[PDB]
Amino acid sequence: GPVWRKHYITYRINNYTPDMNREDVDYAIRKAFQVWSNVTPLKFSKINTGMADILVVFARGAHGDDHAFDGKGGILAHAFGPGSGIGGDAHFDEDEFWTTHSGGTNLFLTAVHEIGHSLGLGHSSDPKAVMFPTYKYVDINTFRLSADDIRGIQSLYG
Ligand SMILES: [Ca+2]
Ligand SMILES: [Ca+2]
Ligand SMILES: [Ca+2]
Ligand SMILES: [Zn+2]
Ligand SMILES: [Zn+2]
Numbered sequence: 001g002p003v004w005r006k007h008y009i010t011y012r013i014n015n016y017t018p019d020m021n022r023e024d025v026d027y028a029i030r031k032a033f034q035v036w037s038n039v040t041p042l043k044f045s046k047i048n049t050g051m052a053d054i055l056v057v058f059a060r061g062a063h064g065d066d067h068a069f070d071g072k073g074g075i076l077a078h079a080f081g082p083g084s085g086i087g088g089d090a091h092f093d094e095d096e097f098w099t100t101h102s103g104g105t106n107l108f109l110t111a112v113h114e115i116g117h118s119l120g121l122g123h124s125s126d127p128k129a130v131m132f133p134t135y136k137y138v139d140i141n142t143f144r145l146s147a148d149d150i151r152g153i154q155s156l157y158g
Contacts, residue, residue: 001081001120002083002120003082004042004088007042008042009045009088010044010054011029011046011052011053012047012049013056014056015057017092017094019104020099020107024107026046027100028100028108028111029107031108032108032115033115035145036116039154039158040119040156041157054089054115054118055089056089056111057090059091059093059094061095065091069094071095073096076105076110076135077092077093077113081120082119090111090115090117092107092110092111100140106137106140108140109138109140113130113131116130116149119156120156121152121153121156124146126148130146130149
């Protein structure tokens with residue numbers, strides 16, 4: 001599968017979920033990028049204008065790619081592996097209730113998983129990995145990538 005062949009990667013938040021404070025959206029996505037650059041050579045920067053490598057989108061139902069969201073529950077978000085255009089982009093189902101904590105769906109945790117996909121990771125069979133397909137709330141202040149997450153991103157980069 002695809003990997004980014006460049007070290008400086010950019011993202012853009014396209015729009016903001018009304019479920020949270022704006023600064024909290026900025027912080028959650030910031031923090032999620034840092035999870036991955038802590039273990040690879042990549043550097044991530046937020047730009048506010050023009051074409052980003054990774055476009056962060058809150059949308060609901062059918063939203064202009066071929067992967068319709070399905071209302072509350074089920075599919076929480078999805079992301080496209082490295083490549084041009086929509087390659088790299090990470091979309092969050094606005095029909096979920098995005099939060100900074102354990103109520104609704106923790107944006108930070110979901111973003112870590114989705115940027116994993118933006119960077120070219122698939123899913124892990126290990127329930128303990130963040131790349132396990134099913135969403136588990138863990139304390140975000142003491143969150144750490146599992147061994148398997150680290151082996152996986154490391155074999156793509158670095
Ligand atoms: Ca893109
Ligand atoms: Ca959903
Ligand atoms: Ca929402
Ligand atoms: Zn989408
Ligand atoms: Zn996934």
